[PDB]
Amino acid sequence: DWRAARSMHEFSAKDIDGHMVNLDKYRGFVSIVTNVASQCGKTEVNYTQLVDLHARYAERGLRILAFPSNQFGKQEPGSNEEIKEFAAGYNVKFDMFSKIEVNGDDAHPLWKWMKIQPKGKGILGNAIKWNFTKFLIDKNGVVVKRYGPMEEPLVIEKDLPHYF
Amino acid sequence: VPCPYLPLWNCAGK
């Protein structure tokens, strides 16, 4: 059934406070969807740059959805409350979600869907490879790019005017 | 430069 979706806007996800979010609220906004972790070598560069992008582009319509996951080196061990508190240290004002799995049979259906999209395909299969993979989503909820763990968020900035 | 995630990941793909 998640296979039949054609837009991110068809999904819902539980935010970091335990409340459901209809992802259709991102309709008309360019969105970055990313899997985060607090204990990765690139935690700092990723959070800092995402906060910076959000601050500078939120008025142009940039939204950021951050999904914690503990699937990559067990680098997100904390509770949702502890992760929320960690994000607060970076002055995060974008949208934090409850911890999920992004690979395997229990992965969040959004993540299952993103990974098989025409412009969401991975390199070396479609599995998320490590923390801080980023998906760029257009104003219609279509996946338009996948950026790998090594591609810092500021790499995405040049692509934003292609979809604003 | 050596891959900074070794040995947990070897920078293969995305």
Closest CA to B14 of A49, A163, A10, A145: A145
Nearest residue in chain A measured CA to CA from B12: A124
User: Tokens for A61?
Assistant: 């319509």
User: Tokens for A163?
Assistant: 């979809």
Entry resolution in angstroms?
1.9
* Distance set, CA A154 to CA A55, A74, A120, A134 (Å): 13, 25, 19, 11
Rounded CA gap, A64 and A157, in Å?
Answer: 13
Looking up tokens 């959805």, which residue turns up?
A65
In contact, A28 and A142? CB cutoff 8 Å: no
- First-to-final CA distance of chain A: 30
CATH code for the part of the protein at A1-164: 3.40.30.10
| B14 → closest Cβ in A41, A73, A122 | A122
HSE value, Cβ hemisphere, 13 Å, CA-based, for A107: 18
- First-to-final CA distance of chain B: 18
Rounded CA gap, A46 and A27, in Å?
Answer: 25
Residues sharing a CB contact under 8 Å with residue A157, sequence separation 6 or more, in sequence order? A53
| B14 → closest Cβ in A41, A73, A123 | A123
Experimental method: X-ray
Rounded CA gap, A34 and A67, in Å?
Answer: 6
- Alpha helices by DSSP H, listed for A13-144, are 43-57, 80-89, 109-116
In contact, B13 and A122? CB cutoff 8 Å: yes
CB atoms within 10 A of CB A94: 19
The burial of A83, by beta-carbon neighbours within 10 Å (0-12 exposed, 13-18 middle, 19 or more buried), is given as buried
Rounded CA gap, A143 and A127, in Å?
Answer: 15
Residues sharing a CB contact under 8 Å with residue A4, sequence separation 6 or more, in sequence order? none
Helix or strand (DSSP H, E) at A115: helix A109-116
Looking up tokens 């891959």, which residue turns up?
B3
In contact, A95 and A21? CB cutoff 8 Å: yes
Looking up tokens 């959070």, which residue turns up?
A47
Rounded CA gap, A96 and A84, in Å?
Answer: 7
Rounded CA gap, A28 and A7, in Å?
Answer: 12
Whether B7 has its CB under 8 Å from any CB of chain A: the answer is: no
Closest CA to B12 of A8, A123, A31: A123
Nearest residue in chain A measured CA to CA from B9: A130
Count CB pairs under 8 A between chains A and B.
Answer: 33
In contact, A36 and A69? CB cutoff 8 Å: yes
In contact, A161 and A138? CB cutoff 8 Å: no
Closest CA to A71 of A34, A125, A107: A107
Cα A55 to the center of its chain, rounded Å: 17
* Distance set, CA B7 to CA A51, A76, B3 (Å): 29, 18, 9
